Amino acid sequence: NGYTYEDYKNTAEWLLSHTKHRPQVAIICGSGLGGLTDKLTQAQIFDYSEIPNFPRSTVPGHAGRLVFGFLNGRACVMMQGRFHMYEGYPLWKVTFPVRVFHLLGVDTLVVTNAAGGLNPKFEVGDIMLIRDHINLPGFSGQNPLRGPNDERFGDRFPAMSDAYDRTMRQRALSTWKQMGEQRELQEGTYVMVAGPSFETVAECRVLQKLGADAVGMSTVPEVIVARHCGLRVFGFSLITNKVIMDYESLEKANFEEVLAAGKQAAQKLEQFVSILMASIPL
Amino acid sequence: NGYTYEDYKNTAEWLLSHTKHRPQVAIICGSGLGGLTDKLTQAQIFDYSEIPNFPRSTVPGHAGRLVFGFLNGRACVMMQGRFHMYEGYPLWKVTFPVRVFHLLGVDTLVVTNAAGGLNPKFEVGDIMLIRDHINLPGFSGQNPLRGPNDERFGDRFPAMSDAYDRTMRQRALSTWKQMGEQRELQEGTYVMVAGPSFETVAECRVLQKLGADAVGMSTVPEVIVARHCGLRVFGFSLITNKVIMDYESLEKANFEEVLAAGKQAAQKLEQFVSILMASIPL
Amino acid sequence: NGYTYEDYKNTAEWLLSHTKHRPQVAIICGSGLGGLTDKLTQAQIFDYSEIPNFPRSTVPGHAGRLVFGFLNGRACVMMQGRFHMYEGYPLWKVTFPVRVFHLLGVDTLVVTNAAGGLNPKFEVGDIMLIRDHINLPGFSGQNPLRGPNDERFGDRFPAMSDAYDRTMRQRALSTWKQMGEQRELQEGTYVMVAGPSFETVAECRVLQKLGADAVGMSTVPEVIVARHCGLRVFGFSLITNKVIMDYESLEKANFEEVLAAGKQAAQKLEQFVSILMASIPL
Numbered sequence: 001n002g003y004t005y006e007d008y009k010n011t012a013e014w015l016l017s018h019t020k021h022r023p024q025v026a027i028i029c030g031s032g033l034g035g036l037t038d039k040l041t042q043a044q045i046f047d048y049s050e051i052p053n054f055p056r057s058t059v060p061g062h063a064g065r066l067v068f069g070f071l072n073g074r075a076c077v078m079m080q081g082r083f084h085m086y087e088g089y090p091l092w093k094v095t096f097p098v099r100v101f102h103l104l105g106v107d108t109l110v111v112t113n114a115a116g117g118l119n120p121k122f123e124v125g126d127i128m129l130i131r132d133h134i135n136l137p138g139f140s141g142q143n144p145l146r147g148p149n150d151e152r153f154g155d156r157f158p159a160m161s162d163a164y165d166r167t168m169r170q171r172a173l174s175t176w177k178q179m180g181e182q183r184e185l186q187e188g189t190y191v192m193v194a195g196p197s198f199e200t201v202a203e204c205r206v207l208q209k210l211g212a213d214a215v216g217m218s219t220v221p222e223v224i225v226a227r228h229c230g231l232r233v234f235g236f237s238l239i240t241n242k243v244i245m246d247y248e249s250l251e252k253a254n255f256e257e258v259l260a261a262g263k264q265a266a267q268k269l270e271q272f273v274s275i276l277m278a279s280i281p282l
Numbered sequence: 283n284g285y286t287y288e289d290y291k292n293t294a295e296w297l298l299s300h301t302k303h304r305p306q307v308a309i310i311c312g313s314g315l316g317g318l319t320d321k322l323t324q325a326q327i328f329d330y331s332e333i334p335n336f337p338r339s340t341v342p343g344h345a346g347r348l349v350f351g352f353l354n355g356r357a358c359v360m361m362q363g364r365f366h367m368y369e370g371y372p373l374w375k376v377t378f379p380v381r382v383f384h385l386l387g388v389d390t391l392v393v394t395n396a397a398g399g400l401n402p403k404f405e406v407g408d409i410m411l412i413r414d415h416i417n418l419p420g421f422s423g424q425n426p427l428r429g430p431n432d433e434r435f436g437d438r439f440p441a442m443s444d445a446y447d448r449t450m451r452q453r454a455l456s457t458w459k460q461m462g463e464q465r466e467l468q469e470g471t472y473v474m475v476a477g478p479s480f481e482t483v484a485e486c487r488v489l490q491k492l493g494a495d496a497v498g499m500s501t502v503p504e505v506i507v508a509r510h511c512g513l514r515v516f517g518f519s520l521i522t523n524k525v526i527m528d529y530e531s532l533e534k535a536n537f538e539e540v541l542a543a544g545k546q547a548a549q550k551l552e553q554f555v556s557i558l559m560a561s562i563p564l
Numbered sequence: 565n566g567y568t569y570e571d572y573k574n575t576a577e578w579l580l581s582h583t584k585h586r587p588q589v590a591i592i593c594g595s596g597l598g599g600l601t602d603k604l605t606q607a608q609i610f611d612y613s614e615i616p617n618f619p620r621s622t623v624p625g626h627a628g629r630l631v632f633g634f635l636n637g638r639a640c641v642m643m644q645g646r647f648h649m650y651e652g653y654p655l656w657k658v659t660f661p662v663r664v665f666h667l668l669g670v671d672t673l674v675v676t677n678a679a680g681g682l683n684p685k686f687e688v689g690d691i692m693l694i695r696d697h698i699n700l701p702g703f704s705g706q707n708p709l710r711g712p713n714d715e716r717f718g719d720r721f722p723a724m725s726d727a728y729d730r731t732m733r734q735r736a737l738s739t740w741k742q743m744g745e746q747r748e749l750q751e752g753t754y755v756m757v758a759g760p761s762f763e764t765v766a767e768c769r770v771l772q773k774l775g776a777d778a779v780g781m782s783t784v785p786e787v788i789v790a791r792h793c794g795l796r797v798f799g800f801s802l803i804t805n806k807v808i809m810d811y812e813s814l815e816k817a818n819f820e821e822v823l824a825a826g827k828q829a830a831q832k833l834e835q836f837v838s839i840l841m842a843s844i845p846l
């Protein structure tokens with residue numbers, strides 16, 4: 001890890017002295033979900049590039065910002081554009097923001113992402129509440145906590161079996177019902193793979209045999225660091241496509257499929273996340 | 283990645299100006315299949331060591347060469363000796379040649395390798411056409427595309443579900459039949475593991491449960507880069523041994539088993555690859 | 565790999581000239597099993613910090629020592645405190661001691677560790693003889709042998725299917741019986757995951773579906789290097805906890821659970837290992 005405790009501290013103190021805002025809930029916007037930032041009030045924007053120690057977004061669009069504000073009753077800080085392992089960033093950079101949030105006083109992390117549906121029940125547009133995850137990169141050594149542990153952040157061996165807050169998942173299922181929606185709220189296991197290339201049929205079948213319901217290339221690292229910090233964690237995936245699981249299919253996954261899904265059924269998540277804020281204690 | 287676009291360009295321009303040859307088909311010879319280079323005509327040899335930017339073959343035998351020539355009607359470039367992740371090379375070095383080939387004007391990549399048979403139907407000597415692959419290293423982050431993407435080569439998120447050209451596999455199955463051969467042409471999924479040590483019984487069973495038919499320590503990376511480049515890709519494995527899958531067996535996999543298999547039934551692949559050239563469009 | 569052959573040689577020659585002891589059996593003590601060092605006679609202690617080229621134990625307790633002595637009839641060298649991948653050490657550092665032992669004249673390696681039970685038959689306190697292992701990190705590239713091979717240590721492609729000495733496992737099962745013990749001696753497959761965070765329910769189920777009986781974050785690397793060296797290898801795990809495999813459970817794995825188990829049923833292993841020494845040929 002190239003960061004020392006001081007680095008996280010310095011970045012937090014810089015932010016704290018450049019904004020009157022004091023966030024309680026940190027929200028990471030997945031692909032095509034950045035619009036969520038438009039629902040904040042008294043919003044204050046910070047480009048990642050201007051924040052000390054922040055990984056500088058190479059060239060995925062040069063759009064990487066931290067937005068502080070209020071979202072339906074809660075002091076929030078949103079990440080519009082997140083870092084991925086496939087871009088070349090080691091995991092201690094990918095998750096650097098999470099530890100900054102903790103030092104800012106955030107006690108809750110809401111993570112969202114786009115994902116390929118592995119579970120056949122799922123349909124494009126569906127929203128999957130994340131009940132658990134399979135950290136494939138983690139089994140091999142790509143775990144954000146690798147390296148000496150800093151007691152100031154947490155324990156050497158944190159548990160992850162209870163990573164996704166049970167209470168929030170219940171209130172999430174409730175809220176979705178209280179809203180009376182067409183499709184039911186899906187729930188399941190998210191498996192992380194490094195990417196950036198999409199899965200083959202044989203790989204899709206592997207992921208399915210392991211019991212995964214959705215596949216993506218992010219999230220798990222941030223969740224692990226959040227939990228290590230003691231933050232409450234809740235999240236979901238927007239199923240943007242059904243992964244090809246048989247050789248008969250003549251279609252293939254693409255960047256267009258994802259953002260298009262994250263174009264129409266996108267707003268649904270935005271509302272959901274906004275309303276869900278009221279369900280977050282304080 | 284330690285290479286810049288210029289590096290691939292410079293290596294290609296160096297090669298293009300040192301040979302009259304202009305290859306269309308790049309062929310990577312697997313272990314004990316290097317003999318294929320003997321069937322080329324008007325052959326021109328280049329030691330890897332003399333080619334700018336090429337990874338210098340440490341000491342597996344100091345024999346690493348790029349051979350340009352004509353193989354049964356096609357302008358080819360063959361790699362005699364390929365780079366493996368287990369030797370210490372990062373994947374952007376292992377696959378460096380593939381991107382060079384693309385800039386040389388190659389539009390087809392034929393990959394061959396030796397592999398342990400996981401599917402019980404398989405027998406030593408069998409030839410398995412590769413229909414799909416499981417990129418285990420890739421799930422964890424060891425994917426040749428990790429790092430910033432260069433649009434000049436391809437997209438950020440390329441698909442791999444259609445990596446192994448359907449047309450070529452059909453024509454391959456045809457050709458094998460048109461030849462009238464003793465054993466049938468096997469077909470299946472190739473799973474890549476980093477190695478260099480051989481699998482344990484428990485690991486063999488894992489690989490089998492995942493749906494893999496053959497196991498090796500190469501190929502997948504080159505295939506991914508080829509596909510990312512837009513090259514047509516076809517390949518197969520020479521089953522050099524049956525991986526031990528039960529504790530009763532008193533035998534063990536060894537370097538001798540592999541090359542010996544790649545000694546007798548080796549020539550069969552050579553002929554097949556040569557004849558298959560006519561089936562490659564232009 | 566940052567070590568050259570000379571480095572292993574220099575460390576061995578330093579040790580050989582600082583102790584009259586000439587070990588035959590190297591023993592790696594797992595978590596909460598370090599007490600085994602108390603049963604040695606004519607013990608001579610070396611702090612890791614004073615041994616040339618040894619990885620310097622960061623801050624897990626600053627307690628890292630190499631103890632030479634006699635254990636029930638055998639010249640031993642014990643590692644009290646072992647290196648883990650999750651601490652940040654690359655595998656060539658984690659396994660550095662193993663190659664030193666080989667040069668010291670050791671021909672047998674006994675590895676012990678604490679592990680979570682995946683097999684439902686297992687109960688906290690149980691002892692599992694290791695019959696095989698699943699090297700998950702290894703599939704991805706994290707294999708201690710990655711990099712150029714040194715013939716002086718072993719072959720480029722060593723087999724691992726017979727890693728855990730059949731004879732010793734039999735004599736181990738015998739010894740345990742000759743002692744007449746309450747619980748039966750468990751036997752099974754050990755799966756290594758990098759850690760340091762504990763497994764989620766979904767991950768536990770993955771590990772179970774793969775056929776693993778116990779899960780830990782060490783051992784496999786040392787075993788692979790030992791085998792590559794030609795050493796005889798035997799080992800076992802102390803089941804310190806039952807990994808959560810269903811969402812109904814309201815408990816979670818923790819550092820306290822492990823050491824507590826490695827507190828009571830710990831001595832049982834110590835005796836077993838001591839007695840087992842007589843079963844090790846010479």
Ligand SMILES: O=c1[nH]cnc2c(C[N@@H+]3C[C@H](CO)[C@@H](O)C3)c[nH]c12
Pocket residue numbers: 031084114115116117195198199215216217240241242243253254255256258259439
């Ligand atoms: O089929 C899939 N496989 C793996 N990841 C995704 C995702 C998730 N994100 C979306 C984004 C690519 O379009 C990249 O960062 C991965 C959507 N569909 C799939």
Ligand SMILES: O=c1[nH]cnc2c(C[N@@H+]3C[C@H](CO)[C@@H](O)C3)c[nH]c12
Pocket residue numbers: 313366396397398399477480481497498499522523524525535536537538540541721
């Ligand atoms: O049983 C096996 N397991 C994994 N790879 C191979 C291979 C393939 N190549 C062959 C070569 C070793 O002999 C090394 O580079 C791996 C043949 N048999 C097996």
Ligand SMILES: O=c1[nH]cnc2c(C[N@@H+]3C[C@H](CO)[C@@H](O)C3)c[nH]c12
Pocket residue numbers: 157595648678679680681759762763779780781804805806807817818819820822823
């Ligand atoms: O449930 C488990 N999962 C993974 N490893 C272990 C271990 C083994 N060691 C023990 C130690 C943590 O308490 C760390 O180095 C891992 C015991 N229980 C479990």
